[PDB]
Symmetry: D2
Subunit: 292 residues, 4 copies
């Protein structure tokens, strides 16, 4: 539910750019079959940026329905206005979702005090477990360990998706929070390293197309079998890197379509279709992972 | 008007975070009297992030009404979803605004081709002049001179607010675009340098509280009187820097309240009240500028 | 000899700026008593920058003499001219030193091919074991894992001091080199993390003044007792950070003098004496480590 | 002379890496004929890093001799040990050089106070004009405008080569120093911008192969004819960039050989020969500049 291989699942779309139920069902069946631990619905990889809150909610509810209790579902609930974050979270109160993934406000670059008040207010308006999400390269701000420690004192703030790729954050956060506070990687290429340092799992883009390998890798890591996990990691490393050859989720949607997991690789503007060079790069990575 | 001193105006709020018409009137009267070239309504400094589109539109309409033809108004129209940008833009068609200030999508980090398709589509569906807005520190993406050059070929894409603070961009862009394309600094501390290199004006935070000095500085710059402009710039430099001592528009709103231009310095979360240290810093800068 | 807690030992000086033998002897006795694994003589912390090659060699030979076979000594041999690196290394051929620490050329920013040819040529002119040293913040260049792998194929290139503080390098290098290639941290604040990921020890500044704790921490790490090691790390973390409050080795020399380990904290220009604020910061860190 | 186009001249070498007098003569004759303002002898581009001080001095003396009073010569005198800088400077006292170009210490990352004491001591022990040289990408430290202002008060500290490429530095420094203090760009690609902002000249790599165009460009810039200067700059821009496609001076030495200005393009390790791809890139840039 908040450990192991968690997929930041794509929102598959028809050619008109609306959610494709047949494709979503196929994806969710795949994750259940693959041993994926949970699904993050309408996170970054799910095109939270270009779905309105009604559409977002429709996808989350559809994902929950189709999951049919077989696999836990975490809703993306991020917003750069605290009022909007609260409103979006309230949509899922008493819904069946097991928790929320909520990103530091983007664009407006709040202070560490602002981040504290933001997440505290959100937490106060829900009984749902909250996973903080830090990704400075996308947001323009950086939720530092000290503030994470402050926020971990709030009862329902229970973990962090740390997407900096800065591995020193693992033990910096760990020393300031209780032993049951969950540390999850948001950076596929460093996620095994992140678990080797004490992290409890990954919210993963790669898991969209290598769900089985990712589940296996994280199980091995949790068991302390890092050399064995590393063999899998090495097979997946080109995907971990090349799934960001063009902006996420352009490559991973293409990959999903290539593997027959979704009907179309359609995205919403300003995401654009994969370049020819992109296709070949990603195809090479899939081949390296043994997925073709 | 798209040259000279253009204020990125604060959205003054009462204690409930709602727009304060009386305060907005005072500000607009102040800019009319002080020679400001135009008003950017609900840009970053106007808390675009935390107003919903309906509130956003209300503020722009209120600003047009209060302006009453005395000073041109430019609407902030940025969104990270191309469909949303287009929809927001339509709310202002035939409103009386003279143009739109439209930011590169934030958080989703589109490619250069993505940015091209975003702004092209926005421009296609309006007759209004469009001013592009690049601010990588906030958005996570960087609209490069090559792509600005492509976009400048679109009839109604007329200029750019360049907020990198990287002065090499001025002549990189200038050489790729027609001589009527407007280059506006979005970085107060480097704006005079930007104008000296070929820039046509500034969309300014400092202009909120030093409107007359900014207007004169920009006129002198336009006339080639850089040494004379620089004397004014030097007295404003502490403001140019310290208005960002805490997240914009926290400092400038406090400054406006201290001068009596607005009734309260209230903001919306995740912006929080200025710190005591911040007040001291900002106060000092106002005094250096001769404003208190 | 190339694992555990290795000290990048200061070059203690009299008030005239020349090596102080009495102080060097006291330091070396301290390291023997403390269980320090080896001594790096005239590395960065030893003011390699401001000693000429004759003076450098005198200090290395004095350190070797005073060690008297009780503790292995690694000579700093870095130079940004390959001819000079070769000449400096040749001074120590058949001397008693057990190996060399050789930094990527600084200032002239060679290519990865240049780095390869540099280190290959050096290795070819000596039988001594070579430890590569990467510290981009000081040198302006970055020896990447791929090139490390290339160089590890040379018989006497046997390890790396990785001072980037970028923990992802550990497993990137490890996968490209043989199992007996040594990975050492050059970044005290992340060194435990570095060992947790597979590193074999640290070449440490902190060990100058906390030799016992550092030895104990590294032993615990090598044994897989990371929680226990972490308790020591937490006690030392303020030193790990604050020993760079002013340029290394200004703080650590002051610390050594304060602990009675050296007679004077004299350095050579352009290093300047510790500031008053500096003194208090470092004193607080020593107190936190229980060393006062 | 400390204004206009100043060439950072290559140290031409035979196949053994020894200075080639015949090639150096050709280069000097070329700069005399092409209107270059002065020659910087054994700066970065002259492989200061890989000549020992005696060879360094030989090249400077040979350059004075060949110049034969026809063009002023500035000696590179930088060292990261203040005592060494002073000693090197004395080798040139009463030599006929008109001044020294002295870099911020590299690798040891001194404080601003350290830099102050370094350059003050150097200036004290010579009558020669000193030009400070700031290039953080290479040295690991950054001489800030405040400290430049302090140093400019020293009689014989007369100017600065500012190689950051950060154009805001021009007027930050200018406002802190007297009107006779010389501001010289050390970044070819931004040099015209630097001059437009108030800079007095450039210490240039590009001038090695486009001496006449550089001399005219700088004269036009000095006269305020920026649009006319910019046309020349645009034909040189590919060289300004691609002369750093591989580490300086690898590209410019190859370019000199291709034009027939020098007999061989040999460098000293850790510089290695230009790649085939590099040749292609550089060749293209020469052609764009009209030189081949
Ligand atoms: K909690
Ligand atoms: K246009
Ligand atoms: K080896
Ligand atoms: K002076």
């Amino acid at each position: 539910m908040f450990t192991g291989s968690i997929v930041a699942i794509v929102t598959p779309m028809d050619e008109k750019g609306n959610v494709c139920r047949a494709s979503l069902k196929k994806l969710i069946d795949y994750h259940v079959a693959s041993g994926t631990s949970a699904i993050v619905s309408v996170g970054s990889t799910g095109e939270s940026a270009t779905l309105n809150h009604d559409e977002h909610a429709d996808v989350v509810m559809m994902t929950l329905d189709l999951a049919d209790g077989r696999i836990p579902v975490i809703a993306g609930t991020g917003a750069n206005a605290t009022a909007e974050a609260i409103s979006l979270t309230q949509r899922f109160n008493d819904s069946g979702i097991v928790g929320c993934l909520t990103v530091t406000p983007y664009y407006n670059r709040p202070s560490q005090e602002g981040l504290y008040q933001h997440f505290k207010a959100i937490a106060e308006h829900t009984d749902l477990p909250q996973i903080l999400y830090n990704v400075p390269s996308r947001t323009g701000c950086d939720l530092l360990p000290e503030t994470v420690g402050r926020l971990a004192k709030v009862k329902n703030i229970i973990g962090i998706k740390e997407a900096t790729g800065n591995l020193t954050r693992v033990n910096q956060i760990k020393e300031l929070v209780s032993d049951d506070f969950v540390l999850l990687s948001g950076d596929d290429a460093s996620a095994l390293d992140f678990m080797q340092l004490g992290g409890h799992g990954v919210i993963s883009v790669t898991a969209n197309v290598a769900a089985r390998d990712m589940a296996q890798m994280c199980k091995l890591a949790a068991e302390g079998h890092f050399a064995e996990a590393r063999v899998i990691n090495q097979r997946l490393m080109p995907l971990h890197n090349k799934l960001f050859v063009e902006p996420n989720p352009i490559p991973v949607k293409w990959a999903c379509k290539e593997l027959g997991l979704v009907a179309t690789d359609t995205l919403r503007l300003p995401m654009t279709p994969i370049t020819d060079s992109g296709r070949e790069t990603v195809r090479a990575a899939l081949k390296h992972a043994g997925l073709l």
